[PDB]
Amino acid sequence: LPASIFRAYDIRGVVGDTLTAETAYWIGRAIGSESLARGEPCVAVGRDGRLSGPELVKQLIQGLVDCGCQVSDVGMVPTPVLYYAANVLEGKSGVMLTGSHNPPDYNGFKIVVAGETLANEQIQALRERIEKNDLASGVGSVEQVDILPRYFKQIRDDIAMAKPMKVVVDCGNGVAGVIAPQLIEALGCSVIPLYCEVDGNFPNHHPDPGKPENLKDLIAKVKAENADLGLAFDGDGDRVGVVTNTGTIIYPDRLLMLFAKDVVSRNPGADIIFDVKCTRRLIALISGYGGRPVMWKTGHSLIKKKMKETGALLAGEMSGHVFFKERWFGFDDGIYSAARLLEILSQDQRDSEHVFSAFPSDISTPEINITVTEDSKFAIIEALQRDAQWGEGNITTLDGVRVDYPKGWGLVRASNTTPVLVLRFEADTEEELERIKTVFRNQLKAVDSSLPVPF
Numbered sequence: 001l002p003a004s005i006f007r008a009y010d011i012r013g014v015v016g017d018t019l020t021a022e023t024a025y026w027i028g029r030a031i032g033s034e035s036l037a038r039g040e041p042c043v044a045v046g047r048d049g050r051l052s053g054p055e056l057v058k059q060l061i062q063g064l065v066d067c068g069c070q071v072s073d074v075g076m077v078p079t080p081v082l083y084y085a086a087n088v089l090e091g092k093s094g095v096m097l098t099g100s101h102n103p104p105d106y107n108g109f110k111i112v113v114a115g116e117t118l119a120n121e122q123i124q125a126l127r128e129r130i131e132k133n134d135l136a137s138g139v140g141s142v143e144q145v146d147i148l149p150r151y152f153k154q155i156r157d158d159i160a161m162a163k164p165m166k167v168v169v170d171c172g173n174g175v176a177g178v179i180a181p182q183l184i185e186a187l188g189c190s191v192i193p194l195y196c197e198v199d200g201n202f203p204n205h206h207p208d209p210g211k212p213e214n215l216k217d218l219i220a221k222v223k224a225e226n227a228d229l230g231l232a233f234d235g236d237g238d239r240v241g242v243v244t245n246t247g248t249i250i251y252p253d254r255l256l257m258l259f260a261k262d263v264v265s266r267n268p269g270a271d272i273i274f275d276v277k278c279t280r281r282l283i284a285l286i287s288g289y290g291g292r293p294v295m296w297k298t299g300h301s302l303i304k305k306k307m308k309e310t311g312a313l314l315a316g317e318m319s320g321h322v323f324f325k326e327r328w329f330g331f332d333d334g335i336y337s338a339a340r341l342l343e344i345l346s347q348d349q350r351d352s353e354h355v356f357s358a359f360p361s362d363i364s365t366p367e368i369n370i371t372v373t374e375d376s377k378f379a380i381i382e383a384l385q386r387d388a389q390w391g392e393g394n395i396t397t398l399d400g401v402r403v404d405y406p407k408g409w410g411l412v413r414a415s416n417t418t419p420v421l422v423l424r425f426e427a428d429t430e431e432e433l434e435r436i437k438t439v440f441r442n443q444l445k446a447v448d449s450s451l452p453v454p455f
């Protein structure tokens with residue numbers, strides 16, 4: 001049975017509750033059926049370092065084999081490593097059992113089928129195969145594969161560190177510690193490990209570098225050891241956080257600026273994708289270097305579809321997923337992105353603080369949240385889209401309502417997993433900021449005079 005675990009970009013839930021082995025079995029069955037339906041019997045399977053996993057894989061794999069698929073099992077590995085398998089093995093399908101950065105009892109499935117990362121209706125399709133028992137049946141197969149070494153090798157062969165660097169690597173007790181300290185070490189660095197022991201209990205901070213609180217120990221170690229950079233991976237390793245030698249947290253939009261400058265120098269006119277939460281500075285910077293800027297929707301999986309659709313050589317989103325296609329395969333991977341970042345910084349005699357500090361900075365507000373209600377969440381964005389008036393602002397309604405003015409912008413959208421409206425604003429001078437926070441405040445009040453707007 002049921003459902004709130006068939007989300008938009010994956011399947012997630014509590015390991016001994018909404019998601020039990022049983023549920024995992026009928027999901028592997030769905031996945032196996034669809035892959036077959038796309039002409040793909042070969043599927044890979046990889047898992048993260050969760051407690052609930054060791055078994056689960058099992059119910060998942062039993063589900064694939066009871067379809068007739070040839071399962072290539074890669075055991076415990078980083079998410080991008082699973083994605084790597086689905087790109088290099090024979091089958092272009094792959095399934096990673098994972099709960100990302102969620103708490104220890106959460107787990108789930110990120111699914112790739114015949115090359116495509118399933119989303120939205122593609123995932124529901126899966127569920128609705130169980131609700132009618134429309135799955136396939138067959139005499140599957142299971143083979144053990146060890147891909148990590150070839151993954152490890154591929155990057156090492158690709159990267160060229162120029163000077164040496166001392167780096168603090170924090171894994172959060174998630175699955176990155178199986179190759180991240182090592183590879184970065186192998187890459188040509190000295191590594192101060194922080195929580196790089198796979199432990200699904202998460203004795204320390206959870207592996208979510210998206211929240212600053214989880215970079216406090218990281219930020220202190222960098223300073224205390226006079227390291228050149230600090231890195232933090234999420235639980236399953238498709239996300240990376242960055243801090244400079246002085247402890248400044250680099251946000252992904254700023255990270256992309258460094259990456260776009262690099263990618264575009266070797267690929268004139270390259271398409272570069274970022275989301276509606278990324279600084280407009282990114283737009284001008286990409287253009288200035290000769291590239292084609294492409295603002296798209298938020299959602300690792302959506303960014304990914306857009307990339308194949310546009311031929312983009314690089315993508316990123318504010319949640320930290322960085323997607324390299326130049327020299328790579330086009331999927332998100334915090335490990336490879338780290339590598340790529342070390343590559344660039346190693347070739348600059350300045351320290352990491354100045355490299356990033358040199359980029360233009362506007363006046364930005366932090367992310368603002370407004371608890372509304374589940375019932376009203378989407379309808380508020382719709383009312384704005386229908387009736388808000390924004391002057392000569394350029395309106396992007398790809399994902400909520402983003403309005404770009406010449407000297408600043410603002411965003412309002414609905415969270416897909418909380419009854420909350422999420423906002424952001426940025427502008428060069430403070431007088432233009434408040435004039436933008438004012439146009440939004442007013443349009444919101446025009447929707448509902450009783451809505452609480454804290455700005």
Ligand SMILES: [Zn+2]
Pocket residue numbers: 100101234235236237238239
């Ligand atoms: Zn992740």
